[PDB]
Design a protein around this ligand. Structure first.
Ligand SMILES: [Cl-]
Lengths: 306, 306
């Protein structure tokens, strides 16, 4: 029993984390096959970051200007190339501890595990969510840049995120592994507006099914609701609108608990309108939106990776 | 910036997790040097668990009755021995991926990372705390037993906990690596009483310093308090009594934020007496007691392991 916020195991990602230094600037990079990926702002000074021209800045650098060190071994750089906002540094040796892997661009609402790294060595791991406004609420100090977010299926590491920058608001932003930003953000140090955030409705529901499965059931109501009615309430509490695809995805959980989705939607609406009234759910006094329906399922059936 | 509930990296522990099977019963074991550690209830049937005599049950088994498989490779067992509630199975091969390590018996209040495993392969990792009544609030399904909790300092893995059983109350219990239970619990399937729990005062304070460090400051008050006065309030809200050792441990945080401990104790007392009043702190509507003062420090200075 029990319900925790769990991350994937970090073994396979740990053996790919290298330290990249170019001039003074040092940040983390990801060594797969014979290539190293890092944020392209490793060629900038603190001053450059105000308004960089990345083309012109790169024209100055040569292969020997990029130092890459894995533990104690030093890689030698043979080529270098710029794809969107990441740099791809070709090296002479292929990584012996390279796992099977893909690169994937996720959607808002999806969750993933972040391995937090300073100077190419690992600090810690945590689970988190791509918000609806494409930010994330991390824990990232100076030097953290180039830490990666990933998922594990079976034995295949799916890299979804690379950390680039902190916003003035205290929140985080970044790219996929081909160098494209999630959201409107750019790698210039200027004031940038994240839109209004919303709560991820489909995930709050997933978490309610987890509470029932674990024995916490006080929020269950006699009443019931329709989709369109439920969505009118949601909207005024800045919740994400619920579609049929979302109901469909909640099916397995509705079956094993025998509580129809719309009956759960009615339970939620009351919580929105009356608050929790000083009770708790899975030990939280707020409504948690950072487990997907696949997360809850996996946590409850105990899937395992290898 | 940011503050997450973070676990240590799991790489080094993952390469020690084996599957132990004895008769029908399969559970997880830990392969270091030439020895495998597992829960001694791997020699029990579901029926035995009601009132087992572990001596007599073991006298029946021989080396060849214990099957140990790491991935695809099979170990051969040369000896077997029972120390308190764990079994030590001597094998012919030493583990090539054995990290430097110790075994440590922690104290209530300490935190640690759990690697959750079914059938010798890893599922996920999370941070948690030894409660004052020596239980823990995990996420553990059937088959989980023999999962380990650990800390990492520098490059040295310190194993502190092995999972044995779930209590009827929905909470978890277990042993150190020499086989001694934390708390009053025994490995018999019977009803067992955990005492009254308390909130870990020193840790709530640590977490308040983390909120100030991150910019959340509304709970700061003009007032102030004494130790003895603060402890009279605490007690009636079932908080752990604060000693001078606890103040001493909070020193570094008091310095860098320039808020004296007793001033923080006064802030807390008001929260106890007036609630949070529908505000949040680091995004929580409750008072969090699962970061130590060493945790917060480490998270805020970005220490790293290697
Ligand atoms: Cl909460």
């Amino acid at each position: 029993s029990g319900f925790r916020k769990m991350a994937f195991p970090s073994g396979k990602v740990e053996g790919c984390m290298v330290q990249v230094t170019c001039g003074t600037t040092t940040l983390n990079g990801l060594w797969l096959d014979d290539v190293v990926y890092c944020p392209r702002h490793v060629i900038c000074t603190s001053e450059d970051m105000l308004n960089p021209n990345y083309e012109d800045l790169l024209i100055r650098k040569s292969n020997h200007n990029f130092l890459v060190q894995a533990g104690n071994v030093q890689l030698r750089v043979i080529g270098h190339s710029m794809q969107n906002c990441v740099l791809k540094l070709k090296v002479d040796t292929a990584n012996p501890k390279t796992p099977k892997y893909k690169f994937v661009r996720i959607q808002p609402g999806q969750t993933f595990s972040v391995l937090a790294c300073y100077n190419g060595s690992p600090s810690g791991v945590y689970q988190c969510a791509m918000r609806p406004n494409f930010t994330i609420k991390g824990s990232f100090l100076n030097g953290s840049c180039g830490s990666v977010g990933f998922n594990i299926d079976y034995d295949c590491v799916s890299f979804c995120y690379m950390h680039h920058m902190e916003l003035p608001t205290g929140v985080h932003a970044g790219t996929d592994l081909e160098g494209n930003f999630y959201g409107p953000f750019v790698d210039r140090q200027t004031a940038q507006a994240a839109g209004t955030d919303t709560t991820i409705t489909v995930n709050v529901l997933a978490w309610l099914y987890a509470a029932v499965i674990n024995g916490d059931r006080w929020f269950l109501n006699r009443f019931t609701t329709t989709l369109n009615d439920f969505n009118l309430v949601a909207m005024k509490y800045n919740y994400e609108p619920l579609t049929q695809d979302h109901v469909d995805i909640l099916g397995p959980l509705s079956a094993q608990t025998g509580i129809a989705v719309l009956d759960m939607c009615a339970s939620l609406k009351e919580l929105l309108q009356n608050g929790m009234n000083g009770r708790t759910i899975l030990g939280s006094a707020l409504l948690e939106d950072e487990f997907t329906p696949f997360d809850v399922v996996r946590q409850c059936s105990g899937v395992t990776f290898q």
